[PDB]
Amino acid sequence: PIPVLDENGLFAPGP
Amino acid sequence: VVVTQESALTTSPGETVTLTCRSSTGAVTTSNYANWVQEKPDHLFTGLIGGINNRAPGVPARFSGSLIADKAALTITGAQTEDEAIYFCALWYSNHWVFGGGTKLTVLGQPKAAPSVTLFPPSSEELQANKATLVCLISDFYPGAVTVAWKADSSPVKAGVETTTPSKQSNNKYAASSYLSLTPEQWKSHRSYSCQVTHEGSTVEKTVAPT
Amino acid sequence: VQLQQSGPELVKPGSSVKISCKGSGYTFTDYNMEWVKQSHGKSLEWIGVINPNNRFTSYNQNFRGKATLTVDKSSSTAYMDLRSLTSEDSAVYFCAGSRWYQYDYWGQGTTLTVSSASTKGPSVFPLAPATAALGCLVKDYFPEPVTVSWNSGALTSGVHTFPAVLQSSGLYSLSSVVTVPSSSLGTQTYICNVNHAPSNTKVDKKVEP
Ligand SMILES: [Cl-]
Ligand code: NA
């Protein structure tokens, strides 16, 4: 899972 | 992976200075989201720039980030005396940050001064505890970089020396200390010892004798 | 805004420690918490990040099996547990709050010392003297810190207490100096008060010419 930004600029698992 | 910064730079108040941040992987890009963090004494870290050249909240307008050729850059436009500090860059590589080694920035905001050096021989009390420390106290100098060399008679000393990194006095000039840790027998085996402090190319030397 | 880290730790090789970082004055859940290791007082190494809202973590592969990041949303606290400790883990550890690929806040740091050594109080020696300089040499204590005052806090002007040197033996030493009128030497009394709370030691030393 690559780190990606969510709506609030925070880290979330990316595809 | 290695991030490289200038070790040290000097500027004067009101001038423009540019610090750079290189990546061993190739050109720095916008997707490295270069961060710049200022370290002031007593482990006081302040984020300055991050994201895509974005100034952190409260950071003065004179700090800006950009790319210059294949490097990231921090520009201080109209440097202030309070900007004398260490500046670290950090680059993002998909899933982790790598920090550079930091740049010591001097901002020449006070008059330069060569150090006042005071060299204390071992105290009789310490010698009775079977030790002998020479203490070289280096005070009231600016800018904040010195080199310390010790001599036994006229022979350079290659062991037993510890020297502190300069830090600010209450009057905002710098001070540093250096120690030469000897046995009583070593102390008494030479006719003199010297602490030699090099500052902006000039040396100040003080000498003590066991007698 | 305050990122308050837990206090210094002295622990034996092989043990584990849990450092905490408690945020206040901001919305804890608006930021990731990142962690950084500062070695030698110089080099910085990124350890990892955790998002307090989803517990998503990313680690520097070099700290996998060393560091474990967790969070307690409710008490606005982030934690880092360091395990199987060795002397290579001795460092100052920082937490920082981030968002949008940018650091906004930094903690004050947590000193971790991994050693088999026990605390050891200092030995204090005089540095005996127009103006004149006099001082106190504070030798071979462990761990940091030592604080120094003169005449119980009455004498502050012209006083400088230096940072410690870390000797090859693992013990620290520092000095404190004061510059005084040569005229007052021989009547005015000068006493450095050395405090080493880690070993529950306090020393008063009168410095005479
Ligand atoms: Cl990694
Ligand atoms: Na730089």
Numbering used by the authors:
A (entry chain F): 2 to 16
B (entry chain B): 22 to 232
C (entry chain A): 26 to 154, 162 to 241
Paper text:
We determined the structure of the Fab-peptide complex by MR with the atomic coordinates of the Fab alone. We refined a model of the complex containing most of the peptide residues at 1.65-Å resolution to an R-work of 0.189 and an R-free of 0.234. The refined structure revealed that the peptide adopts a beta-hairpin conformation that is bound in a groove formed by the heavy and light chains of the Fab. There was interpretable density for peptide residues 4–14 in chain E and 2–16 in chain F. Interestingly, there was no electron density for terminal residues 1 and 17 of the peptide, the thioether bond between them, or for the side chains of residues Glu8 and Pro16. The buried interaction surface was ∼570 Å2, most of which was mediated by the heavy chain (∼480 Å2). PISA identified four hydrogen bonds between the Fab heavy chain and the peptide, which were present in both copies in the asymmetric unit, and none between the light chain and the peptide. Within the peptide, there were four and six hydrogen bonds between backbone amide and carbonyl oxygen atoms in the two copies (E and F, respectively), which is characteristic of a beta-hairpin conformation. Peptide residues Pro4, Leu11, and Phe12 made the largest contributions to the buried surface area and solvation energy in the Fab-CP2 complex. Peptide residue Asp7 formed a helix cap at the apex of the hairpin, and Gly10 was in a left-handed helical conformation. Based on a superposition of the Fab with the Fab-peptide complex, the conformation of the Fab did not change substantially upon binding of CP2.
